[PDB]
Structure formats: structure tokens, C-alpha cells
Write an enzyme that holds these catalytic residues in place. Structure first.
Site, short mmCIF file in Angstrom:
data_model
loop_
_atom_site.label_atom_id
_atom_site.label_comp_id
_atom_site.label_asym_id
_atom_site.label_seq_id
_atom_site.Cartn_x
_atom_site.Cartn_y
_atom_site.Cartn_z
N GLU A 109 -4.16 9.09 12.27
CA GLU A 109 -2.84 8.51 12.03
C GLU A 109 -2.20 7.91 13.30
OE1 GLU A 109 -0.79 7.01 10.43
OE2 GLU A 109 0.19 8.39 9.04
N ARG A 110 -1.54 6.75 13.20
CA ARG A 110 -0.82 6.13 14.33
C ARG A 110 0.53 6.84 14.40
NH1 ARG A 110 -2.64 1.10 11.67
NH2 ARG A 110 -4.69 0.85 12.48
N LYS B 55 0.83 -1.22 0.00
CA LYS B 55 0.00 0.00 0.00
C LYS B 55 0.86 1.27 0.00
CE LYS B 55 -2.23 1.16 3.77
NZ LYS B 55 -3.27 1.23 4.83
N1 LIG Z 1 6.85 -2.83 -5.92
C1 LIG Z 1 7.46 -3.63 -5.04
N2 LIG Z 1 8.54 -4.23 -5.51
C2 LIG Z 1 9.18 -5.02 -4.64
N3 LIG Z 1 8.85 -5.24 -3.36
C3 LIG Z 1 7.74 -4.63 -2.94
C4 LIG Z 1 7.01 -3.82 -3.74
N4 LIG Z 1 5.91 -3.30 -3.13
C5 LIG Z 1 6.00 -3.82 -1.89
N5 LIG Z 1 7.13 -4.64 -1.74
C6 LIG Z 1 7.58 -5.35 -0.55
O1 LIG Z 1 6.50 -5.37 0.41
C7 LIG Z 1 6.92 -4.73 1.64
C8 LIG Z 1 5.71 -4.03 2.32
O2 LIG Z 1 5.16 -3.03 1.43
P1 LIG Z 1 4.54 -1.68 2.02
O3 LIG Z 1 4.30 -0.67 0.96
O4 LIG Z 1 5.39 -1.10 3.11
O5 LIG Z 1 3.17 -2.25 2.58
P2 LIG Z 1 2.56 -1.69 3.90
O6 LIG Z 1 2.73 -0.23 3.99
O7 LIG Z 1 1.17 -2.11 4.12
O8 LIG Z 1 3.40 -2.12 5.04
C9 LIG Z 1 8.06 -3.79 1.19
O9 LIG Z 1 8.93 -3.40 2.27
C10 LIG Z 1 8.77 -4.65 0.15
O10 LIG Z 1 9.61 -5.60 0.82
#
Ligand SMILES: Nc1ncnc2c1ncn2[C@@H]1O[C@H](COP(=O)(O)OP(=O)(O)O)[C@@H](O)[C@H]1O
Ligand SMILES: Nc1ncnc2c1ncn2[C@@H]1O[C@H](COP(=O)(O)OP(=O)(O)O)[C@@H](O)[C@H]1O
Ligand SMILES: Nc1ncnc2c1ncn2[C@@H]1O[C@H](COP(=O)(O)OP(=O)(O)O)[C@@H](O)[C@H]1O
Ligand SMILES: [Mg+2]
Ligand SMILES: [Mg+2]
Lengths: 57, 456, 86, 456, 456
Positions: D179-180, D153
Site C-alpha cells: 500500500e502507498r 475502482k
Molecule cells: N459511480 C460514480 N458516480 C459518479 N461519479 C463517479 C462514480 N464512480 C467514480 N466517479 C467519479 O470518478 C472519480 C474517481 O473515482 P475513484 O473511485 O476514486 O477512482 P480511483 O480510486 O482510481 O481514483 C470520483 O471522485 C468521481 O468524481
């Protein structure tokens, strides 16, 4: 003929249990919609009784 | 003397009068500059009374003068009301001139006493298979047609008005309480063209009307029926929808200063229903056979209004949306519908056992519905398979094309006698028709027509 | 011909005004006169007689019927027709 | 003039003013000698106003002086807000000094008029293949984002923030509704490390703040987006959670004593949603497009909060834990995600047929996979085996390397045009790339990059 | 000094006293002429106190003079209370004349301090199979018998009184709170005929008594038990229904001017329960062993009253309507019931393993019950078929005919020991009785009799 009929039986039983699994899914989906209606109605009725009792006190 | 408007809130108006001239409960009042009628509901103290307007309140203001009439709302009664249309206040609304009335009666009265009650059990044939089988009606008794929106109540009633008028020779009274104005126009012209109009009194207070009209129209129609009963006649009283009398009471209850009860209903729900329902009865003087439609809010039969109505009726006909969805009309539910006349001492053992046999088969079929839905019919026992096959045929044979439903489909209407009804269901229960196909029983009137339909 | 795009959104607007005026709610929190809100509106759509038109126009329009046709719209949740407003 | 605090009950404060100096509804008031702001909610009469405190009421007392400001809560707007963290009142919560503001705007205003609407349904080119193909976004539209945590996300929001600024000359605003504090600090550092912080303005209403702050933060972020829109730009407004905006309204409505509605929500539920959502539109000057995370209470899509929100959404993007497990990123579900813009009258017949073609292949492949997992791969027909091969190529071609994801993917980021997206999927559907291996389509960008990867 | 009755509404009475002479909270007042007592619940201000009448209000009039007693309701305590029946105010309700009192204590008191709490874990044998297996009791602890209407709360309390109270050499207190007057008469004649009455203090407040009586009888019985505990004695305290104390507070709460909470209960539900339950405890001075029956409204254990009660007890015994509906008695649920004493470090590993073994078998059977009802027994595995047979046998071996239930069962009563209970359940778990029929374990005390019943 008997052994080939037993192979046909297991194949027929696979389809019957696949259909039973799918038919149960439709019943679960309909009951979930009825459950959500009862969940929303219970909250609305409790709030109506609390507002009604506090208007009198 | 006269008073002055002190407060106006929707349909409810407060009027102040001199302390020595305060009007009585249910007394009619008239506003001087508009001639709008008000009915007193309660006395608040300090010469102030609270009333409901019998018309629109738009354009009224505080300080207008109000005249007390010294009596309750009085309507014309007797032979002069036959073939005429009237409003809640007894005024003619058919453009045919003034009513040639000999006397007027106040719309508020006490119910006939315990010693005046009638013990009638004479069977009334309706010509409708499901009703004559499980819901037998009686002359001088009360019938209720319970159902949600669009299930068959106005059609199933108009078919009863058509069928009961074959044997009945007296007068009828019709009270339209809070329903469609178009259906009142359709019914008036149908009877006028058929020359039936000179034996029916018509009263209307439809959905377009303010709360005060919808609340008192039932009393106006009943007052005309009570005049004919008290003359020693046998009359029919039809109420288009008795739930609207209670609903008009709910719209006004909070304005009358009352605390609400369960699901927002007025605290007086059961008393308002009993005060009207107890007047609709046969006595030692004459008889009133009454048919009333009862609306079921959001299809819930446990709702306070429908739940409180069942105890006031001799025969209860419960219509279902699940049955109407399969194509079956009239959409009556045999397992929920019942009558006081369904007794071996009233209808005889042959009818009673046929009706009990039909209910046993339909009840057992209802228990198998979930098993049949998941695993299908092929897993049932050889006994259950035979019972389910007969249940499906009974359920289809209960259907019947009506003479008022001809416009919807095209099929001609059918009238089935009680003798033919018992013979058909007894044969299906005995197994005399196990070989005929299930679709041969759908929409065919008498049992012999199912045999002819199976030839195709 | 008249179209009412969302008669269910009119009921939500009338419920807000009624609750802010502290009128006791009923089924699904709607006011006690919610039926009358829609019934008094839709009873106006109709066909009137030649005598009604002749009377309304003081004789100017003679020999014609008048009409108002209505197409109200109602949104349902999960295809449930048994809800209170529908 | 100045007023006096007359009553304090939790976050609700009543203030008395001279009769000629009573403050207007939504006006901001300042307590003398204490950093506390009160927003006026209602005028009670007798010179008394009811207000909600935008912070803690601890230590306040009756009789303290209060000053009217003459206007609603007014916040800094323009270029100076980029790369900064602010509270509901526009104060810099980051320890980076005062904001270099040139102008301030009040947070309350009417939505753009009927005559201010832009015109035709123009699309917003995100540069992301799966979104531009299956979930087309309209300029001025509202997008609902669904899914759990750890599914990409945040990375999806950062990619959209980079692309709107570099490829369209736009800007972004992020409204942290409830927000947290831990996640708010983590997101600020992730955007600084990903070099996107100077392209976005951050407005946070933390969970530990009173209900009034959480309710107004969405209007503060929206006011900053409206200034950028008026500069002639296309803007992205991100709302951390639209359910928390609804709940903050329920909390404030209960504090003010209003009578609750169905399921316990505020009576103003649809109006409070409409006041926020109607400002997000496309106008003659520029547009604001919004991506809103949506939470569904008790998994019930018929609940008043989800039901009121879905009336404003134009597209639905669903993130799948299962797709993320296969190594594909972004984890969008091409079958569950939808758009109102996916219509041949809106996007044209070529784009529509290509997108529907991809969904048909992926839907049939989902069914074939269950057959392979039960009966085995040998039970499928030769045409099904070819469809499985095309479905795997389409499924991998939906993947893309993001400029903010170079740290995870070890590959340079890519921006793919809508023209290149349609051409690539149309070719795979027609079979122009059937000779290439499935690994050639994974993480490449446009279709020419797959052709070159296959030679390595 | 004296006050005057100013208002009467149901069981609640307002009394006005001189401002220099207002009576204290919980102070007892006496009406002049009429034989009634009032308890101050609140001081309303302006010299008026709100009170609950400790008798019927039918004779009361406004303007009756009332005398302040200067103290709370004070009841007789000590040895003189043994073998006597008393009301809420401590008056004798038996024809045996005045109580030989030497001291009186006020019914309102502070709970023992944190430093005064006891720590004993001495196991108490009950002679009932299910209870001794899954719900082991301890001396000086608190026991709760949870259940709806008609499942065995009084019957299990009578069996526990027979197996503990009679054999015990200390003093007992039996408090009938909102009980049927017929049960109180049967128990009095039972204690008198059994020669046990000289060891018991009996306090009765049945359902025919005013809300003020039912709101305070639990405090009267507890005040007598506290006098014995504080003398260094070991005491038994029995309460037939503690739910009736909460209900009396709900019945009067709204007339005391308190806004209602969830499910219509008083806002003070958790504090009114805590103020009572914290006094029912064992201390460093002496001990109180207590058994309370807890009514569950509509069989719902999630109802606020039952849900708030679990945290106050050491042993929780749950009675199930579904087990009682199968003729099985005592109708105890082994999965929902529990005790603080069910620990290997408190009892032993052999007992604990047997209890967890029984629970494991019954928990697995709960998911298979629904499987067998749709697809039949033959579709289960060889291990599942065997386990289901043992579960149905275990479910029957939990049953036992009680001596106090001979009038309902017809068969004689059985006392079973802890070792006998353990050995019987281990035998069914290990398979030593797989050859015996299912009906042989139904109503048969120890394991030997089951082997004998199989031969009949
Ligand atoms: N486009 C992407 N390419 C590679 N890895 C990704 C990608 N999108 C998400 N990830 C992996 O998923 C993990 C969690 O994604 P994140 O955006 O932080 O989700 P959330 O915010 O819900 O925690 C990232 O730290 C990475 O390891
Ligand atoms: N055979 C039929 N086919 C379709 N509709 C029918 C049929 N028979 C009866 N009806 C329905 O009967 C209804 C009669 O009134 P109903 O809706 O049941 O009562 P109400 O309007 O008073 O609540 C009509 O609205 C009509 O739709
Ligand atoms: N162990 C039992 N054996 C036989 N009957 C019982 C037993 N427990 C309860 N009952 C039946 O229930 C009634 C007595 O139970 P009771 O203790 O009054 O239940 P509750 O206190 O839960 O209302 C009688 O009708 C009796 O037959
Ligand atoms: Mg109808
Ligand atoms: Mg009992």
C-alpha cells in the site's frame, strides 16, 4: 461514364486502404506475441548465467 | 578385487576399491546381489570411481559389493546378429533364445585414421523428388533429417529404408536411441511378415529406459556396423534419433560434477558428438551409408545440439512446420536443405541448373511474402506475377504421396526417377505448364500425372 | 483408460523440486530430465500381448490382451504449440 | 528457552537455540528489549534457524537474546477488527488505542478439505446491474479487476462493501499488499465520509516495509475473513494488488538465496499462489468471495505472474476510460469483461440468453459506429438504425446511482435485484420500451423507474 | 621483506609474505630471477596478497621468491617523455636507449577536488562539417567518439589529431589501449615523418599484451598528462579505446573472486570507470582537452559499458553502422549526437537554428522512409515530397573526404570552416539548391564544390 468511374475508383480505394489497415493489425499482433516470447527468454537466460557464474566464484 | 557402493544419486553411483585394484575408465562393473551393470566414467582419487548404471537404481543401497570385469561393455558381432533384437548390453530381447555369437567386441573404439578415409561420390537415387533434386545422396555418405516434433522424420526415413533396399543387397544395422517402443514393435513385425528381417540387425534403448541405456545404445549399434564394414561389406546404418545420445548426456552431466555450458548443456557437447560421429564413416576396407534423424528442440535450428550436428553430415534435409501446415509432404525446405553432391562435376550441368533455378524462384517468392500479405498479389510487377505463379506450382510439385503414408489418407504411393524429376521442374521453369491450374501439381508423383489431373 | 488433467502442472511441480535441489536449469528454466519425466510415464500406456498376460498371471489368464489408454492434457499460452513442454 | 542472534545480513537473521528448544518453521520469535518480530523460514541444523525480520534491522547486534512464542504470527480476529487499521502483526497502526479482541488466530493453516466444499455454483447478488448481468460472481469465487486510475475502482469497492453488509448481513476485509502511505490515508477518510468504515477491517503492508511484511499481509487479512466465515457469514476479501504479493515472494526467495526460475520469478511461484487462493472458497458454514486488482507486467498476458493468477480467477471485470468519458458509471466494459459463471448450465437459459443478447447488440453497435464515422448515418439500413436506438437504450440502462456516490450524482442510491435486471434488459431487447427517449434509462435503477422518469 | 609465489591461474598470481610484512593495495612486487612485475589488487589475509601479473605467466613457478617494492607502479614524467614510445611500467619500447628521467610518479591517484574544477566554454573548430554543426567542442573539455566495429573511430580520431594536435603549441599524450599493433606503427611513422613527434608522449599497450597491462596503460598515459597539467600547461590527451580498460577488468574480475553483474560485467563497472574518468579533467592550475574513442559492443548503445560512459563526457559524437552501410562518410548520426556547447548563449542563435533545422528535417524523414518503401513516393503530400528530397541531400552533404582517408576514398581531403558549414546547410534548408541532383552533395567539402559536381 468517366466521372462515374472516378467515383467508383475512390470507393474501391476506400475499401483497399481499410483492408490494408486491418491486415497490418494482424501482423502487429503476431509480432507482439513473438516479441513477448523473446522478452521472457532473455530474462531467463541472463538469470541462468548470473546464477551459474556466482556458483563458481 | 571388489569394491563397495559409497554414494547413489539417481543414475550415477560412486564405488570405492582397494588402491592397488582401481578399475579403468569405461570398464564394466557388476553389483553382486542384483547383477546390475555399471560403466566407469572417471576416477575421483582415494580408490573411488564414479559410474553410470546400465539399468534401474531403485532398491540399491550403500555398502553393497561390486565386481570389476576387467573390460568395457562387450557385445556380440557378425552374422549371428542378423534377424535378432538386442539391448544396450548385447542381450537378446526377442524371446528367440541366446545369440550364436563367434566373438564379442568392446563398444568403445577410436575413429578410423586420416589415411583410411574413402573419397566416394557415386550418386544414390531415393525416388523422392525434393531429395533427388536439391539434396542428392551418395553411397557411403552421411544424411541427417532435421525437424521439430511431428514434422515427418520417422515417416520420411521409413520411406528411405523402403526405397534404398530396392538396389542394396548387403546388410543393415538399426539403432533405436531413446524413441517409441510401439514403433520398434511395428517395424519388427513389418519386416518379419515381409521376410526382410534376416538381413537386418536391431538394437533398442527407447524412451522408457534409464539414462545409461539411452547414452550407450548408439555405440552398441555402431559396433555391429563396424564389424560388417571391416569384413569388406557395404552396409546401411540407421540411427532412430541421434539427439537422444546427447540428451542422455545432459541428464547425467551435473551428477558427474561438471559445470554447465550455454542453455544448460554439458561442457563436453561437441566432443561427445565428434567421438561418436567420426566412427560412422566409410573406409578403404568397406562402406557405411548412414541416415540419422536429428530432433530440433522447440523448432529452434540455432540450439546448440542441432547447430553442432550440421558439420558431421554430407547431406542435410531440413523439415519445416510452416510447410507441413500448408499440406505439403514431405515437408522439406529447399532453401535450408543442401548436399555436398550438388556440384556440376558430380551431377552434371542439367541437374545442377534445374536445382539452382528452383532455388532462385523460391527465394524471390519468399522476399515478396510481406508485400503480398498487406497489399495482395495484384500490386506486383508483370515479371514478379509470373514468377510467383511458377513458385506456387514448383512448391506444389515438390509434394509426393509415399508408400508408408497410404494408411494416413488412402492415396497410393509413387516412386519418381531422377530423369522424371529433372524433366518436370525444367518444364515448369521454362514455362511449358503456365496454362495448367495450380492444384494439378499437388500430390501427383511424375509430371505427366499433373497433365492428367488438370483434365478434372 | 487414464486421464492426466494437467501434465503441464506436473512439469511445474517437478521444476520447483529440481531448482530447490540446485540442479542446473535448461530451456524455459526446466530441468534437463523434463523429457524423461513425461516419456517414462506415457510409455506405460500401451497394449500388451497374450504371452505377456499369460506370463504375468503365471497361467491364470489365458487368451487375452491387456491395455492402458491415455489422454494427457496440455495447456498452451496464446495458442503457441512450438513451446518446450508441448 | 531462549536463543542468541548469531548473524545479521540485511533483513535475514540467523538465531541459535539449545538443541531441545529449536523453534518450528513459521514460528514467531521476539528480540528482547526491542520491538522486533522474526518469522522462522528454515532450520539449518546445529540448533541454528534462519528467519526474516518483520521490521527494520538497524541498531540490532549479534548476541542479543531472542524468545520463542510457541506458535506462528497470531493476529486479533472478530467484530473488534471492524473500522480499524492494522499492520501485518495485527497491531493498531491508527492512534485509536488497543483492539477489543476476545480471540487470536495464527496466520498459517491448510485450505478447507475435499469434504468441506459447499456444493452447487450459487451466485452472489451484488445489486449492480452490469456486474449481475454480464459479470456474474459465484459465492466463494475470485474476481480479477483490471483498469487504470481515476476510473471508479475505489467507488466500486465501497459500493460492494455497503451492499454485502446491509443486503446480505456480511462483512468485508481489505488487504493493502504494498500500500502507498498517501493512498492508504486517503482511502481511510473516503470510507469514513461515505459511512462504510464500520463494515470493513483494514490491514495494510506499506511499500516501505521489508519484503516479509508485504508477503504475509495477505494471510493476515485472510485470517480475519476466515473468522467471519466461521460465524456463518458470506465475506468479501479485497486485495489491493495480487502482483505485489507475487513480487514480495520473489524478493524473499532471492534474500533466502533460492535458485531463480523462468523470467526470474521464485521457484515456488505456483505453490505460493495456490496456498493463498485455495483458502478463498465456499464451505458448509459460509463463504469468502475475493475481488483482486491485477497488474500485467510489460502488457504481456503470457508472463508467469499473470498466467499463474488467471488459473485461479472465476471472473474478470474491466474498467474503461472511454465509458467513463461518456458519463456512464460504473465504467465496466460489457464486451471485454467476462465470467466462468456466464453458462446456461450454471445461471439458466433465460439469464444466459438475456446477457448474450445485450452483448450481441452492443458488439454490432460498435461496428455500426465506425461506419457512421466514415460513410455517414445515411448509409445504414432501417433495421441498423433501429438497432442503434436499442443499443443506446441498453448502454444507458447499464448505468446506476450508488449510495456511496450520492455526493457526485446528486441522486439517491439504488440496489437492483437479478430478477429486476434480467426483466429490464429482456424488455429493451424485445422492444417493449422503444417509445421511451434514451435519457429515460440513464441513472434510474429498475425498469419501472425508467417508465416513471419518461413522464417528467 | 620478500614473499613467495603460492598460486598461478592465468594472469592472476597469489604471493605470500611475512604477516608483519604484507605489501599495500596496488603495491608493485617483483619476481626473483624471472623478468615479471605483479600488482597487489587485494590483501587476502594470513600474509597472502592477490596480484595481477604485468607480463606473461608461462615461465612462472610456485615457490619463486618475490620482493616487495614498498610503492605502487611508478613511471617517468615530464619533458624526458616527449618523442618516446613506452610500455605500462614506463620502460622505453623504442630502440632509443634509457629515458632522461628526473622524477617518477605512482600511477594511482585521487581525483582533483570539487573546489579545483575549471569552468571554460571556449569553442574549438575541428574542420569537420557534422561535428562543427551538431557537436561543437570546447578547450579543456571531454569528447567521446561512440561506435561499433568498422565505422570510423580511429579515422575520425586521426583527422582530429591532424586538425588540432599539429597546430597546437602545448604538449600531447597519445595512449593506444587494446589497439592493433599495425595502427601504432603507422601513427608513429606518421608523427615522425610529420616532424610532430617532439611534442607527443606515446604510450602503447596493444591487444597481444597480458590483462594486467591493458588494465593499467590508461593510468600511465594519464599520469604523464597530469604532470604537464599541474605545471600550468594546456595539454591534449588522446585514448584510442577506453572500452579495453573495462574489458581487462571483466577478463580478470572472476579470477579476482568477484561475482558477475548484468551482461557479464564486473560489479565494479561504474566505480572503476569513475575512478579513471574523474582524473581526466581540466582544473584551476592547467587544462586537459581529451578525445576518447568508445567501442559499442554489437552496436548496442544500451550495453552497460557504453551506457555508463555518456555521463562522463561534454561532447558525445555517435557513429552509425546504417549510414556507413550506404557509403556515406564520416558516418555520424546528427540525431543521436550532442554537445554541452550547443546553446545560443554559448555560440549564437544563427548556428543553433541551423543545427535544430537540420535535425528537424532528418527526424521527419525517418518516419517517411518506411512509408515510401511500402506505398511509394507519389502518395506523399507536396510538402512531404519536397522535404524528403532536401533530407536525402542534407544526408549526403554531411559527407566529406578526409586527408587521412585518401587511401580508402581515392579522392583528396577537404577541410571546411564553421561559417562555410553553416552557410551550406542554410542554403539546402531555405531551398537555394532544390534544382541540383542528389548525387552532387556526396563527398564534396564546402557548398561551392557541390554546384561544380552537378556539372560533371
Ligand atoms: N459511480 C460514480 N458516480 C459518479 N461519479 C463517479 C462514480 N464512480 C467514480 N466517479 C467519479 O470518478 C472519480 C474517481 O473515482 P475513484 O473511485 O476514486 O477512482 P480511483 O480510486 O482510481 O481514483 C470520483 O471522485 C468521481 O468524481
Ligand atoms: N502426411 C502426413 N500426415 C500427417 N502426419 C504425417 C504425415 N507425414 C508424416 N507425418 C508425421 O510424421 C511424424 C514422424 O516423426 P516426427 O514426429 O517427425 O519425428 P519425431 O517423433 O521422431 O520427433 C509422425 O508423428 C506423423 O505425425
Ligand atoms: N571517413 C571515411 N572514409 C572512408 N572510409 C572510411 C572512413 N571511415 C572509415 N572508413 C573505412 O573503415 C575503415 C577504417 O575505419 P576505422 O577508423 O578503422 O573504424 P572503427 O575505428 O570504427 O573500427 C577502412 O576500411 C575505411 O575504408
Ligand atoms: Mg518420430
Ligand atoms: Mg579502429
Amino acid at each position: 461514364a468517366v466521372v462515374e468511374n472516378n467515383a467508383c475508383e475512390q470507393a474501391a480505394r476506400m475499401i483497399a486502404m481499410k483492408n490494408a489497415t486491418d491486415n497490418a493489425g494482424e501482423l502487429i499482433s503476431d509480432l507482439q506475441l513473438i516479441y513477448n516470447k523473446a522478452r521472457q527468454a532473455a530474462i531467463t537466460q541472463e538469470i541462468s548465467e548470473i546464477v551459474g557464474g556466482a556458483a563458481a566464484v | 578385487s571388489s569394491g563397495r557402493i559409497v554414494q547413489i544419486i539417481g543414475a550415477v553411483i560412486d564405488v570405492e576399491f582397494p588402491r592397488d585394484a582401481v578399475p579403468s575408465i569405461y570398464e564394466a562393473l557388476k553389483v553382486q546381489g542384483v547383477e546390475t551393470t555399471l560403466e566407469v566414467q572417471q576416477q575421483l582419487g582415494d580408490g573411488v570411481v564414479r559410474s553410470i548404471a546400465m539399468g534401474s537404481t531403485e532398491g540399491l543401497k550403500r555398502g553393497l559389493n561390486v565386481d570389476s570385469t576387467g573390460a568395457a561393455i562387450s557385445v556380440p558381432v557378425g552374422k549371428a546378429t542378423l534377424g535378432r533384437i538386442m539391448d544396450v548390453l548385447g542381450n537378446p530381447i526377442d524371446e528367440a533364445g541366446p545369440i550364436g555369437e563367434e566373438e564379442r567386441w568392446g563398444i568403445h573404439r577410436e575413429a578410423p585414421s586420416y589415411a583410411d578415409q574413402a573419397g566416394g561420390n557415386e550418386l544414390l537415387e531415393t525416388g523422392i523428388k525434393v531429395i533427388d533434386l536439391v539434396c542428392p545422396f551418395a553411397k557411403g555418405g552421411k544424411v541427417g533429417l532435421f525437424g521439430g516434433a511431428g514434422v515427418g522424420k520417422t515417416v520420411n526415413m521409413m520411406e528411405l529404408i523402403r526405397n534404398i533396399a530396392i538396389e542394396h543387397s548387403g546388410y543393415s544395422v538399426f539403432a533405436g536411441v531413446g524413441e517409441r517402443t510401439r514403433e520398434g514393435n511395428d517395424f519388427y513385425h513389418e519386416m518379419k511378415d515381409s521376410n526382410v528381417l534376416d538381413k537386418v540387425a536391431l538394437v533398442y534403448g527407447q524412451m522408457n529406459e534409464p539414462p545409461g541405456n539411452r547414452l550407450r545404445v548408439a555405440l552398441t549399434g555402431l559396433t555391429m556396423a563396424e564389424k560388417f564394414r571391416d569384413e569388406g561389406r557395404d552396409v546401411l546404418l540407421f540411427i532412430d534419433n541421434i539427439y537422444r545420445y546427447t540428451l542422455a548426456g545432459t541428464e547425467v552431466s551435473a551428477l558427474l560434477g561438471r559445470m554447465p555450458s550455454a542453455v544448460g548443456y554439458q561442457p563436453t557437447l561437441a566432443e561427445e558428438m565428434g567421438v561418436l560421429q567420426e566412427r560412422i564413416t566409410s573406409t578403404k576396407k568397406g562402406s557405411i551409408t548412414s541416415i540419422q534423424a536429428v530432433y530440433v528442440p522447440a523448432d529452434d535450428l540455432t540450439d546448440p545440439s542441432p547447430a553442432t550436428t550440421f558439420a558431421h553430415l554430407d547431406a542435410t534435409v531440413v523439415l519445416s512446420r510452416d510447410i507441413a501446415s500448408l499440406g505439403i509432404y514431405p515437408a522439406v525446405d529447399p532453401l535450408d536443405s543442401t548436399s555436398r553432391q550438388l556440384d556440376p562435376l558430380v551431377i552434371g550441368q542439367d541437374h545442377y541448373d534445374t536445382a539452382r533455378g528452383v532455388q532462385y524462384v523460391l527465394q524471390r517468392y519468399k522476399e515478396l511474402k510481406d508485400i503480398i500479405a498487406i497489399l495482395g498479389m495484384d500490386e506486383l510487377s508483370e515479371a514478379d506475377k509470373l514468377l510467383v505463379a511458377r513458385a506456387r506450382k514448383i512448391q506444389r510439385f515438390l509434394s509426393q504421396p509415399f508408400f508408408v503414408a497410404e494408411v494416413f489418407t488412402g492415396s497410393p504411393g509413387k516412386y519418381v526417377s531422377l530423369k522424371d524429376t529433372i524433366a518436370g521442374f525444367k518444364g515448369i521453369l521454362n514455362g511449358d505448364y503456365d496454362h495448367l491450374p495450380e492444384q494439378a501439381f499437388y500430390m501427383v508423383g511424375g509430371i505427366e500425372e499433373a497433365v492428367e489431373k488438370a483434365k478434372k | 483408460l487414464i486421464v492426466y488433467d494437467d501434465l503441464s502442472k506436473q512439469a511445474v511441480a517437478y521444476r520447483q523440486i529440481s531448482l530447490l535441489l540446485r540442479r542446473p536449469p535448461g530451456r524455459e528454466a526446466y530441468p534437463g530430465d523434463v523429457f524423461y519425466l513425461h516419456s517414462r510415464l506415457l510409455e506405460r500406456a500401451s497394449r500388451v500381448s497374450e504371452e505377456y498376460v499369460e506370463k504375468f498371471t503365471n497361467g491364470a489368464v489365458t487368451g487375452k490382451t491387456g491395455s492402458l489408454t491415455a489422454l494427457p492434457i496440455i495447456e498452451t499460452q496464446a495458442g503457441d504449440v512450438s513451446a518446450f513442454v508441448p
